[PDB]
Structure 1
Amino acid sequence: MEHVAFGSEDIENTLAKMDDGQLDGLAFGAIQLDGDGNILQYNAAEGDITGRDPKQVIGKNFFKDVAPCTDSPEFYGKFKEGVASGNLNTMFEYTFDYQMTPTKVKVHMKKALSGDSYWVFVKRV
């Protein structure tokens, strides 16, 4: 297993070195989005939590296609405020309930070290 703790202060530096295969060794869900919300990376732990097949969601828009329950001021609204500002670091609890059993999770959104990319980390609560 890859040893990185959910919510670590330097998580973006640690994950910058990770290929899709190493991202799959994380103890929590990790999704990398571009500024428009398109999925660039989606790890195995995230698929375990949500039921989505990782390879199938890459390239889809997270807010429009995959996760409509997140299209709200409380999730997507925070993401879009962060992209526009060029800075994002927020953690909050949320319930995923689209085409799945309602599941309570802790979400951490953070701007990646890379230019136009943002991370969404997820763990069960």
Structure 2
Amino acid sequence: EHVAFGSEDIENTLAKMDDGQLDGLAFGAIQLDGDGNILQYNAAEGDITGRDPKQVIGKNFFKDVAPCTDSPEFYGKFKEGVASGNLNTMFEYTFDYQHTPTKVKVHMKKALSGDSYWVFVKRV
């Protein structure tokens, strides 16, 4: 899939993509509901993080999968965006829960329709 991390219209290009199409991206992509439950999780993300994309679907990202992100700098920004119904933030972060510390660039952006939210990830 020919889409660049950080592109202005990423939410339109990815909108309603099925699981298989999302696996074609060059960067990690997760779709969350407004409570943080994982709706989609692509192959590129699993390669970065070690998680098995099939097993994490349905888990809560902040409470279960990614406690290192349960902080004002990541979860706090997410929940503020869900509450306001708009989110578009890019920042670096280190993943270090039961894995070798890995620094990444994160882009969180509200999905175009409904009340869903993207978390995009690439290595830095």
Q: TM-score range by the shorter chain?
A: over 0.9
Q: Which sits farther off after the overlay, 46-55 or 13-22?
A: 13-22
Q: What are the superposed Cα offsets for residues 66-118 of structure 1, whole Å, 9 maximum, x if unpaired?
A: 00000000000000000000000000000000010000000000000121100
Per the alignment, residue 82 of structure 2 pairs with 83
Q: How many residues align?
A: 124
> How high is the TM-score relative to the length of structure 2?
0.99
- Distance in 1 (CA, whole Å) between partners of 2:91 and 2:39 is 22
Q: Which runs of 5+ in 1 are unaligned?
A: none
SS state at 1:56 partner = helix
Residue 18 (str. 1) matches residue 17 (str. 2): yes
Report the secondary structure of 2:73's partner residue.
coil
Query: Structure 1 segments of 4 or more deviating over 3 A?
Result: none
Q: Deviations over 1:13-38 (max 9, x none)?
A: 00014110000000000000000000
How large is the Cα RMSD of the aligned pairs? 0.5
Whole-Å Cα distance in 2 between the matches of residues 98 and 24 of structure 1?
24
Name the counterpart of 2:6.
7
Per the alignment, in what secondary structure is the counterpart of residue 45 of structure 1?
Answer: helix
Q: Does 1:49 align with 2:62?
A: no
Deviations 1:31-55 (A, max 9, x none): 0000000000000000000000001
Q: Secondary structure at the match of 2:72?
A: coil
Percent same amino acid at aligned positions? 99
Aligned match of 2:30:
31
Task: Give unpaired runs (5+ residues) of structure 2.
Answer: none
SS at match of 1:25: coil
Displacement of 1:10 in angstroms is 0.2
